[PDB]
RNA sequence: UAUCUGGUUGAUCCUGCCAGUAGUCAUAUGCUUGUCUCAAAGAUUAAGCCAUGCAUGUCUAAGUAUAAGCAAUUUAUACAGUGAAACUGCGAAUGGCUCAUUAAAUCAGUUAUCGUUUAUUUGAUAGUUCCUUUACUACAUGGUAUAACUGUGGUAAUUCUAGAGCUAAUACAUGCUUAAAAUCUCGACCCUUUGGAAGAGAUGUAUUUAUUAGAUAAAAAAUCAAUGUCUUCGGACUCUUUGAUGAUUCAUAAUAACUUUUCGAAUCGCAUGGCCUUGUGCUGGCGAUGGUUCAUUCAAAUUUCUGCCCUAUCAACUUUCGAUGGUAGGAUAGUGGCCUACCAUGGUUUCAACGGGUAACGGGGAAUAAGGGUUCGAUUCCGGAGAGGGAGCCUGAGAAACGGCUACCACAUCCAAGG
RNA sequence: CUCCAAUAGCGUAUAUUAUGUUGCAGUUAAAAAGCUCGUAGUUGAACUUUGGGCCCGGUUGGCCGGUCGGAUUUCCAACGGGGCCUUUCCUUCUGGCUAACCUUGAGUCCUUGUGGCUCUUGGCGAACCAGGACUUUUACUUUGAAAAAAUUAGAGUGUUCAAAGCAGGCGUAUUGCUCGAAUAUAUUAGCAUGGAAUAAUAGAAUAGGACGUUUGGUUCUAUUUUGUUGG
């Protein structure tokens, strides 16, 4: 069970910090919260539907121009 | 710190492995003499058991000997000159075994003419009886005359001076001379 | 485990020893000596379990701190001290002199022997090898090495050694027909003649012994000791004499036994 | 750190707590020769199955093999020392009878009111634990 | 293979305190030493009469043949004066109650008294260490 | 899924179905709990944190006693019984605890060391030591430099220690004695020979290198070298030693030298014998301790062959920075890419490599069982690994040691704030 | 208040327990890929010494029972085993155990005896010693050795019974005698061994083959004898 959760990870840093080397190594091979990430999720779909609104707007005003 | 061990090492397949116990006593590997020539001095290793070593480092003489006529004189090394594993040890002069060396052609030369009476180059009877007794055998080489008449001999080293801090050797003669005159020569 | 142990926990010791589990927790351990480990016994599962002379591991001491007991003549005084096959144990007060032989249950028997045979113990050699100076030497069974044997003595040959002296007094070879004692492996204590031997150049020789009621059976090399000639042993066995009972025999031997 | 003392329980339940006719036998048995819980009557049970057992493996040996005659004449031999057995039916047949009673009849308790000296079973069983 | 030229590498080679002399002219000009590799094999002519050098050949070097003898197919030839043979068994199942091929590649040293090629079943024995993955000298050549 | 009870309608039979009905032996929990024998004590995947105490020290007649320690009273004016402290030696590397890591790794059976280290134990083993070996050099026995102890002190504090004065050794550092020959080298000699010749030097053991021997499969001549025993002066070569293994450049011996020269007893207790020229003359007993190398023993380190749970929606991996191999070196107790320099392009893989998951230490073993199997094994024995995490290392035969040290991350104790 | 069950023990919750090698199912109600080709994998027809003849006896079973509860003698019944001979290498040679009576000089105890044996004048090559000189390789299967102790099965034994334990027992108990601590198991790998059915493998097709007292030399290794070590 290498790379497991410890109870406390503070007071074992000198092993991570192998096992960080071990992982680097075995799996250069293919290298070559989850709230955090709802959140990410709908900010940027909120910034694109604020875009997307926006362009809308200014389409319908030239639009008015040409009736 | 340098370890002899082979837990280290990528499996025969390319794998990978981890580590399953510390580093041991019985695994460690000392550092290197890189022993130069020059005004003798020797650090004494307590290895495993007890067991001396005698890591030497700065020696300038050797036991060489001259395995055809069958003597050895204590002699005294005065340079590198070809090493086969690594051209860098020619550079900083440092006795390694193999290292092909030049040393000193006196005690060679007096001892020669001593036994035979030849005077290697270009009365109390019994003396006279002996080198008369031995004639026949009063016949070098070629090549190891001209040496003689140079001053010094080319020998080889066969001694390892970093594990018992004597650097004795042999002199080259027959077709391991031709070898290593052609490598030295062709060289330079 | 970073150095020799020095502890054996009973339960791991040699089981010809019989010694009786839940009477502690440890066992004597042999210390380094003539036999080897699993195929000694100290003198004090001899002094205190087998003879019943002392009652402690305590008594044995006051016992071979007095200067009483002597193994092959010489005195010995380190309480758990390896004796092995083929010694001499000598108690000057009892006048007795046993000599540690086997019996075919594989144990260690308490076989008395009178005086002069105590004087003498037989010794496999082991090896033959020029020392130094050029002197050869022998290697018996029990560690002993010595110089100038009679060069008619290869690997396998039975010497027969005078304790006092130390030197070779006689010899016997090794070919069929030789009468042969078992110590090793599952016949551990059986006594046949030799019959055939099988060569195996790379390992582990093996020898067809049969004993005196014609059972035949094989052993390595490694576990065969020669004692003697056909009839005629050196030694004296122990009673039973090497035979092998089996089991229905053995009860109807002690049933018709019945004598009170 | 020490050797085990090893042991082993005497008894085992049976297949089903009720089967009328094994309440009624244990009722039977235990009535008539003064006992105190099923766990008399389970361990006697025990006994008489690894005594049938053994038996019965046997007899799936053939006639002249050691093991079987071997093992054969000490089972036989115990079993007619302690009485459960007869004296002339001593072949290695006759154990796969032997009923639970043969064994609750070599009791000590009832052996004493056998004697006579008892005047009943339960008279018995306090006569035997009074020293 | 050692691929005469034998002076090829960057040391002379020779075997070790195997001295010919200068001072005497016969005509056989290589003193030579061969040991026999005991077991029954046979040491080959042509490490007897050769010329090549190597120091981890069993009739002509300084190894030595004890332990486990074992056969295989050579499977490739491609490192200097090693090869890798291959090893079949057929492992028993015993809940199935059937077997399956299973197989181990082995390198092994080749000494140059030998001429091997792919295909072909070869004998060899066991040495010490002679370098990383290599345990084991080829000591007879069958087919 | 047997057994038993019940429901399936207006009833009763017979089918069928449905529900309930069983030991488990694991965890948690409740109520009860008098006697005899016995013996166990894990768990938050938290290998999380620890107040206080203890768990490792040791003396015989036989290493060192002027305690200004104690007791004497019996031959003890160098000492002599006992005996703190301290020096020296040995041990602390075993035991006990835990299961975090670890998936050909550990481990299990089976090999190997002709590839190495080994305190101790047991058996062997050591007439050679300086010198042109006579103008001496202690061998009835050589030299300092410290502990405890005394004395002057520092600091809040610790199993902290400084400065001065003593004195020891089985500490440390030095350094002698003995057989008889034989053997080679250098040879003053005289007299020329076909040559012999006084003497002087070296010879133990260990180390380091070069060389030699360590044989063996059966005829005879011609050939010279050269005459070596006998010379029967021509020559017959007459008689010719040599271990082990499957196997060696093995054991072992020999030659020439080398070495910041290893060992070859300046030690200790009880006894006091013979001698005979009576000298404090000559020898001499039972032990203790130490010592070189070889073997043995307790061990160690490497190592041969076969054997692991789930995963392919993990199919290519290792190779810059050793990956497979060759040659040489360095390092090690020793083999070895174990590391270095140069060279080659190899090595494993659908017979599943490589990479993930493991509430994976492996085994003996435990349970269920008609069997085949399936599950469990931190846990009384063996093997590994660890001592909060990572990295180093000292002394020692033995340690990468944690009831040893040193630094760093994490915790945390005392403080006069300096430690 | 009356029963019932277990009883110095008894209850409740949660889990768990009573995939198909042996040994499952696929038209109609789990599930045959739409189709063919195809590498790994698994699998693959028959065939090579068969058969007879002679001798030897094991171990049973029957007639038997000689005896003071089995010591065994005549037969044939079967069952396993061996050795010859039938075209049947049974590896070849080295001086030896010469193996063996193929070898021979005389004698006979005893039912009339091819029902029964002590010593030796050319000998026998296979007694395998050790020695050489080499030989197709597996799978399977028997047997041996191995796989520590405790655990498991199990023999003995009145721990007062029992779980256990490996103790104990018997006398002249006034000075001492004796039995024990068995046995089996353990599967894959490695080692050793008998078997030669089944299933693979390999030899003589360009004959580059095989045996041979043959006769060309090319060669190289060195035993002995030419003083003796070199040539
Ligand atoms: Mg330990
Ligand atoms: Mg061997
Ligand atoms: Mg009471
Ligand atoms: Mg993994
Ligand atoms: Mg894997
Ligand atoms: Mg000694
Ligand atoms: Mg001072
Ligand atoms: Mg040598
Ligand atoms: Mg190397
Ligand atoms: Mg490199
Ligand atoms: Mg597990
Ligand atoms: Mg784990
Ligand atoms: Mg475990
Ligand atoms: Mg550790
Ligand atoms: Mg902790
Ligand atoms: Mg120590
Ligand atoms: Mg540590
Ligand atoms: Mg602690
Ligand atoms: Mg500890
Ligand atoms: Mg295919
Ligand atoms: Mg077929």
């Given at each position: 069970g290498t790379y497991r959760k410890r109870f406390n990870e503070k007071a074992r840093s000198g092993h991570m910090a192998k096992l960080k080397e071990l992982k680097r190594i075995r799996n250069k091979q293919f290298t070559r919260s989850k709230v955090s990430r709802l959140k990410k999720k709908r900010l940027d779909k909120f910034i694109e539907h604020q875009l997307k609104r926006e362009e809308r707007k200014t389409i319908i005003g030239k639009l008015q121009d040409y009736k | 710190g340098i370890s002899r061990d082979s837990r280290h090492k990528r499996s025969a397949t390319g794998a990978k492995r981890a580590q399953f116990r510390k580093k041991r006593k019985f695994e460690l590997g000392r550092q290197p003499a890189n022993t130069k020539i020059g005004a003798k001095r020797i650090h004494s290793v307590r290895?495993?058991?007890?067991?001396?070593?005698?890591?030497?480092?700065?020696?300038?003489?050797?036991?060489?000997?001259?395995?055809?006529?069958?003597?050895?004189?204590?002699?005294?090394?005065?340079?590198?000159?070809?090493?086969?594993?690594?051209?860098?040890?020619?550079?900083?002069?440092?006795?390694?075994?193999?290292?092909?060396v030049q040393i000193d052609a006196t005690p060679f030369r007096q001892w020669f003419e001593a036994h035979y009476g030849q005077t290697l180059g270009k009365k109390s009877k019994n003396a006279e009886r002996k080198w008369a007794a031995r004639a026949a055998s009063a016949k070098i080489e070629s090549s190891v005359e001209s040496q003689f008449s140079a001053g010094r001999l080319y020998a080889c080293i066969s001694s390892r001076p970093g594990q018992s801090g004597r650097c004795d050797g042999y002199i080259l003669e027959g077709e391991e001379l031709a070898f290593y005159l052609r490598r030295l020569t062709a060289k330079k | 485990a970073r150095g020799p142990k020095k502890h054996l926990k009973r339960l791991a010791a040699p089981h010809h020893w019989l010694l009786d589990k839940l009477s502690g927790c440890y066992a004597p351990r042999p210390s380094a000596g003539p036999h080897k480990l699993r195929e000694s016994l100290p003198l004090?599962?001899?002094?205190?379990?087998?003879?019943?002379?002392?009652?402690?591991?305590?008594?044995?001491?006051?016992?071979?701190?007095?200067?009483?007991?002597?193994?092959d003549g010489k005195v010995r005084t380190d309480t758990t001290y390896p004796a092995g096959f083929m010694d001499v144990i000598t108690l000057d007060a009892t006048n007795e002199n046993f000599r540690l032989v086997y019996d075919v249950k594989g144990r260690f028997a308490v076989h008395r022997?009178?005086?002069?045979?105590?004087?003498?113990?037989?010794?496999?050699?082991?090896?033959?090898?020029?020392?130094?100076?050029?002197?050869?030497?022998?290697?018996?069974?029990?560690?002993?090495?010595?110089?100038?044997?009679?060069?008619?003595?290869?690997?396998?040959?039975?010497?027969?050694?005078?304790?006092?002296?130390?030197?070779?007094?006689?010899?016997?070879?090794?070919?069929?027909?030789?009468?042969?004692?078992?110590?090793?492996?599952?016949?551990?204590?059986?006594?046949?003649?030799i019959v055939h031997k099988e060569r195996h150049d790379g390992g582990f020789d093996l020898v067809h012994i049969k004993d005196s009621l014609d059972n035949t059976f094989v052993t390595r090399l490694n576990n065969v000791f020669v004692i003697g000639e056909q009839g005629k042993p050196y030694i004296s066995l122990p009673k039973?004499?090497?035979?092998?009972?089996?089991?229905?025999?053995?009860?109807?031997?002690?049933?018709?036994?019945?004598?009170? | 750190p020490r050797a085990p003392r090893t042991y082993s329980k005497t008894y085992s339940t049976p297949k089903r707590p009720y089967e009328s006719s094994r309440l009624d036998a244990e009722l039977k048995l235990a009535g008539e020769f003064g006992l105190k819980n099923k766990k008399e009557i389970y361990r006697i049970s025990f006994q008489l199955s690894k005594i049938?057992?053994?038996?019965?493996?046997?007899?799936?040996?053939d006639e002249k093999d050691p093991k079987r005659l071997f093992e054969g004449n000490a089972?036989?031999?115990?079993?007619?020392?302690?009485?459960?057995?007869?004296?002339?039916?001593?072949?290695?047949?006759?154990?796969?009878?032997?009923?639970?009673?043969?064994?609750?009849?070599?009791?000590?308790?009832?052996?004493?009111?056998?004697?006579?000296?008892?005047?009943?079973?339960?008279?018995?069983?306090?006569?035997?634990?009074?020293? | 293979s050692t691929e005469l030229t034998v002076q090829s590498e960057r040391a002379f080679q020779?075997?070790?305190?195997?001295?010919?002399?200068?001072?005497?002219?016969?005509?056989?000009?290589?003193?030579?030493?061969?040991?026999?590799?005991?077991?029954?094999?046979?040491?080959?002519?042509?490490?007897?009469?050769?010329?090549?050098?190597?120091?981890?050949?069993?009739?002509?070097?300084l190894v030595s043949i004890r332990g486990k003898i074992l056969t295989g197919t050579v499977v490739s030839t491609k490192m200097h004066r090693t090869i890798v043979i291959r090893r079949a068994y057929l492992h028993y199942i015993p809940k199935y109650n059937r077997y399956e091929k299973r197989h181990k590649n082995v390198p092994v040293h080749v000494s140059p008294a030998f001429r091997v090629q792919v295909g072909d079943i070869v004998t060899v024995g066991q040495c010490r260490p002679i370098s990383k993955t290599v345990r084991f000298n080829v000591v007879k050549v069958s087919a």
């Open positions: - | 290895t495993r058991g007890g067991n001396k070593k005698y890591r030497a480092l700065r020696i300038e003489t050797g036991n060489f000997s001259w395995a055809s006529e069958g003597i050895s004189k204590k002699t005294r090394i005065a340079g590198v000159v070809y090493h086969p594993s690594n051209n860098e040890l020619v550079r900083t002069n440092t006795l390694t075994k193999a290292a092909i | 004090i599962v001899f002094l205190r379990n087998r003879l019943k002379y002392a009652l402690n591991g305590r008594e044995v001491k006051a016992i071979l701190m007095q200067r009483h007991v002597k193994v022997i009178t005086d002069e045979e105590a004087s003498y113990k037989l010794g496999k050699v082991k090896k033959v090898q020029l020392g130094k100076k050029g002197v050869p030497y022998v290697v018996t069974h029990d560690g002993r090495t010595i110089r100038y044997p009679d060069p008619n003595i290869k690997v396998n040959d039975t010497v027969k050694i005078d304790l006092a002296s130390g030197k070779i007094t006689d010899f016997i070879k090794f070919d069929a027909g030789k009468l042969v004692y078992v110590t090793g492996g599952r016949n551990l204590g059986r006594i046949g003649t039973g004499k090497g035979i092998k009972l089996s089991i229905a025999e053995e009860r109807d031997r002690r049933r018709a036994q019945q004598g009170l | 049938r057992r053994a038996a019965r493996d046997l007899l799936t040996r089972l036989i031999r115990r079993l007619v020392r302690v009485g459960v057995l007869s004296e002339d039916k001593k072949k290695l047949d006759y154990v796969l009878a032997l009923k639970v009673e043969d064994f609750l009849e070599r009791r000590l308790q009832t052996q004493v009111y056998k004697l006579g000296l008892a005047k009943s079973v339960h008279h018995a069983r306090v006569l035997i634990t009074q020293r | 020779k075997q070790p305190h195997i001295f010919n002399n200068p001072k005497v002219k016969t005509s056989k000009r290589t003193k030579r030493w061969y040991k026999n590799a005991g077991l029954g094999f046979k040491t080959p002519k042509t490490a007897i009469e050769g010329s090549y050098i190597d120091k981890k050949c069993p009739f002509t070097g």
